[PDB]
Protein backbone atom coordinates (compact mmCIF):
# COMPACT_ATOMS: atom_id res chain seq x y z
CA UNK A 1 0.00 0.00 0.00
CA UNK A 2 2.39 3.08 -1.45
CA UNK A 3 -0.83 5.54 -0.45
CA UNK A 4 -1.46 5.81 3.15
CA UNK A 5 -3.78 8.00 5.25
CA UNK A 6 -1.77 11.15 6.65
CA UNK A 7 0.91 11.17 3.92
CA UNK A 8 -0.33 10.73 0.50
CA UNK A 9 -3.60 12.19 1.46
CA UNK A 10 -5.93 13.77 4.08
CA UNK A 11 -9.47 12.60 5.61
CA UNK A 12 -11.36 16.16 5.79
CA UNK A 13 -14.59 13.85 7.94
CA UNK A 14 -16.84 15.86 5.15
CA UNK A 15 -20.17 13.92 4.24
CA UNK A 16 -18.40 11.09 2.10
CA UNK A 17 -20.60 10.61 -1.45
CA UNK A 18 -22.24 6.89 -1.32
CA UNK A 19 -20.49 6.00 -5.00
CA UNK A 20 -17.41 7.54 -5.98
CA UNK A 21 -16.93 10.89 -7.31
CA UNK A 22 -13.76 12.98 -7.79
CA UNK A 23 -14.23 17.11 -7.98
CA UNK A 24 -11.90 19.55 -8.63
CA UNK A 25 -11.56 22.79 -7.15
CA UNK A 26 -10.07 25.07 -9.35
CA UNK A 27 -9.54 29.40 -9.99
CA UNK A 28 -9.40 31.07 -13.51
CA UNK A 29 -7.15 33.68 -11.79
CA UNK A 30 -3.62 31.17 -10.93
CA UNK A 31 -1.58 30.46 -14.04
CA UNK A 32 -0.01 27.56 -11.91
CA UNK A 33 -3.37 26.28 -10.87
CA UNK A 34 -4.82 26.22 -14.61
CA UNK A 35 -2.00 24.48 -15.67
CA UNK A 36 -2.11 22.09 -13.27
CA UNK A 37 -6.12 21.29 -14.45
CA UNK A 38 -5.24 19.54 -17.26
CA UNK A 39 -3.06 17.60 -15.50
CA UNK A 40 -6.91 16.72 -13.24
CA UNK A 41 -7.80 15.95 -16.92
CA UNK A 42 -5.48 13.40 -17.48
CA UNK A 43 -7.18 11.95 -13.93
CA UNK A 44 -10.27 11.65 -15.79
CA UNK A 45 -9.29 9.96 -18.67
CA UNK A 46 -7.54 7.47 -16.29
CA UNK A 47 -9.77 6.92 -13.88
CA UNK A 48 -12.00 4.04 -13.57
CA UNK A 49 -14.85 3.66 -15.74
CA UNK A 50 -16.98 3.15 -12.49
CA UNK A 51 -15.36 6.16 -10.72
CA UNK A 52 -17.41 9.54 -11.26
CA UNK A 53 -15.75 13.05 -11.76
CA UNK A 54 -17.16 15.98 -10.81
CA UNK A 55 -15.72 19.68 -11.73
CA UNK A 56 -15.90 22.79 -8.89
CA UNK A 57 -14.49 26.41 -9.64
CA UNK A 58 -13.83 28.25 -6.53
CA UNK A 59 -14.39 32.40 -6.07
CA UNK A 60 -12.56 32.99 -3.08
CA UNK A 61 -9.12 32.80 -5.49
CA UNK A 62 -10.78 34.84 -7.65
CA UNK A 63 -10.99 37.73 -5.05
CA UNK A 64 -13.40 41.23 -5.43
CA UNK A 65 -14.27 39.48 -8.66
CA UNK A 66 -14.33 36.02 -7.83
CA UNK A 67 -18.14 35.77 -7.71
CA UNK A 68 -18.11 37.00 -11.42
CA UNK A 69 -15.62 34.13 -12.46
CA UNK A 70 -18.21 31.41 -10.54
CA UNK A 71 -21.04 32.86 -12.89
CA UNK A 72 -19.27 32.49 -16.22
CA UNK A 73 -18.51 28.88 -16.03
CA UNK A 74 -22.13 28.54 -15.01
CA UNK A 75 -23.02 30.39 -17.88
CA UNK A 76 -20.59 28.24 -20.24
CA UNK A 77 -23.48 25.55 -18.90
CA UNK A 78 -26.39 27.37 -20.25
CA UNK A 79 -24.96 27.67 -24.12
CA UNK A 80 -23.05 24.02 -23.65
CA UNK A 81 -19.56 25.84 -24.22
CA UNK A 82 -18.17 24.77 -20.65
CA UNK A 83 -15.67 22.80 -22.93
CA UNK A 84 -14.38 25.17 -24.96
CA UNK A 85 -14.83 28.74 -23.24
CA UNK A 86 -13.55 26.98 -19.59
CA UNK A 87 -9.88 26.93 -21.34
CA UNK A 88 -10.67 30.20 -22.88
CA UNK A 89 -10.36 31.70 -18.94
CA UNK A 90 -7.52 29.57 -18.44
CA UNK A 91 -6.04 30.21 -21.54
CA UNK A 92 -6.55 34.14 -20.97
CA UNK A 93 -4.90 33.81 -17.15
CA UNK A 94 -2.15 31.54 -18.18
CA UNK A 95 -1.60 32.58 -21.43
CA UNK A 96 -2.86 36.11 -23.14
CA UNK A 97 -2.30 37.01 -18.67
CA UNK A 98 -5.35 39.26 -19.55
CA UNK A 99 -6.98 38.65 -16.70
CA UNK A 100 -11.03 39.97 -17.26
CA UNK A 101 -11.26 43.45 -14.83
CA UNK A 102 -15.19 43.41 -15.18
CA UNK A 103 -18.23 41.62 -15.97
CA UNK A 104 -17.59 43.98 -19.24
CA UNK A 105 -14.58 42.76 -20.40
CA UNK A 106 -15.44 39.14 -19.34
CA UNK A 107 -18.66 39.35 -21.64
CA UNK A 108 -16.16 40.64 -24.83
CA UNK A 109 -14.20 36.95 -24.14
CA UNK A 110 -16.95 35.09 -24.96
CA UNK A 111 -17.75 36.79 -27.80
CA UNK A 112 -14.14 36.55 -28.91
CA UNK A 113 -14.26 32.90 -28.73
CA UNK A 114 -17.88 32.98 -31.14
CA UNK A 115 -20.06 33.12 -28.55
CA UNK A 116 -23.50 35.20 -28.67
CA UNK A 117 -23.66 38.12 -26.42
CA UNK A 118 -27.54 37.64 -26.38
CA UNK A 119 -27.66 34.25 -25.48
CA UNK A 120 -24.08 34.89 -22.73
CA UNK A 121 -26.30 37.67 -21.31
CA UNK A 122 -29.30 34.77 -20.80
CA UNK A 123 -26.83 32.47 -18.88
CA UNK A 124 -24.97 35.00 -16.79
CA UNK A 125 -28.82 36.20 -15.76
CA UNK A 126 -30.01 32.33 -15.68
CA UNK A 127 -31.26 31.73 -11.89
CA UNK A 128 -29.32 28.17 -12.75
CA UNK A 129 -25.80 30.01 -13.03
CA UNK A 130 -26.69 31.63 -9.93
CA UNK A 131 -27.16 28.49 -7.96
CA UNK A 132 -24.12 27.29 -9.51
CA UNK A 133 -21.59 29.29 -8.61
CA UNK A 134 -23.18 28.70 -4.62
CA UNK A 135 -22.89 25.51 -4.93
CA UNK A 136 -19.28 24.67 -5.83
CA UNK A 137 -18.01 27.59 -3.63
CA UNK A 138 -19.61 25.16 -0.54
CA UNK A 139 -17.85 22.50 -2.30
CA UNK A 140 -14.41 24.21 -1.11
CA UNK A 141 -16.16 25.23 2.19
CA UNK A 142 -16.95 21.91 3.63
CA UNK A 143 -13.97 20.70 1.78
CA UNK A 144 -11.18 22.48 4.29
CA UNK A 145 -9.39 23.46 1.10
CA UNK A 146 -7.06 26.40 1.51
CA UNK A 147 -5.98 26.72 -2.20
CA UNK A 148 -6.63 25.01 -5.59
CA UNK A 149 -6.01 23.19 -7.32
CA UNK A 150 -7.48 20.96 -4.78
CA UNK A 151 -8.41 17.02 -5.71
CA UNK A 152 -11.68 15.96 -3.36
CA UNK A 153 -12.15 12.10 -4.01
CA UNK A 154 -15.76 10.71 -2.34
CA UNK A 155 -15.90 14.30 -0.80
CA UNK A 156 -14.26 12.86 2.19
CA UNK A 157 -10.67 12.50 1.12
CA UNK A 158 -8.04 15.21 0.59
CA UNK A 159 -5.47 13.97 -2.40
CA UNK A 160 -1.98 15.25 -1.76
CA UNK A 161 0.19 13.65 -4.09
CA UNK A 162 2.97 15.12 -2.91
CA UNK A 163 4.73 11.77 -2.71
CA UNK A 164 3.26 10.91 -6.89
CA UNK A 165 6.00 12.33 -8.69
CA UNK A 166 3.98 10.86 -11.96
CA UNK A 167 0.41 10.63 -12.60
CA UNK A 168 0.88 6.58 -12.09
CA UNK A 169 1.54 7.36 -8.19
CA UNK A 170 -0.90 10.17 -8.05
CA UNK A 171 -3.98 8.31 -9.88
CA UNK A 172 -3.26 5.38 -7.51
CA UNK A 173 -3.82 7.96 -4.28
CA UNK A 174 -7.12 9.04 -6.31
CA UNK A 175 -7.91 5.32 -6.72
CA UNK A 176 -7.52 4.09 -2.79
CA UNK A 177 -9.72 7.42 -1.92
CA UNK A 178 -12.08 6.16 -4.48
CA UNK A 179 -12.58 3.19 -1.96
CA UNK A 180 -11.88 4.97 1.24
CA UNK A 181 -14.87 5.35 3.72
Known amino acids: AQFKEGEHYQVLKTPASSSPVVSEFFSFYCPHCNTFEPIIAQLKQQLPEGAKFQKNHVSFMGGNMGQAMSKAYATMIALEVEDKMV ?41 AVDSMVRRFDKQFQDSGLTGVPAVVVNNRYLVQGQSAKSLDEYFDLVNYLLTLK
Do not use: C, S
Not at 88 to 102: A, C, E, G, Q, S
Open 87 to 127: PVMFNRIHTLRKPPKDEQELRQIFLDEGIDAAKFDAAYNGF
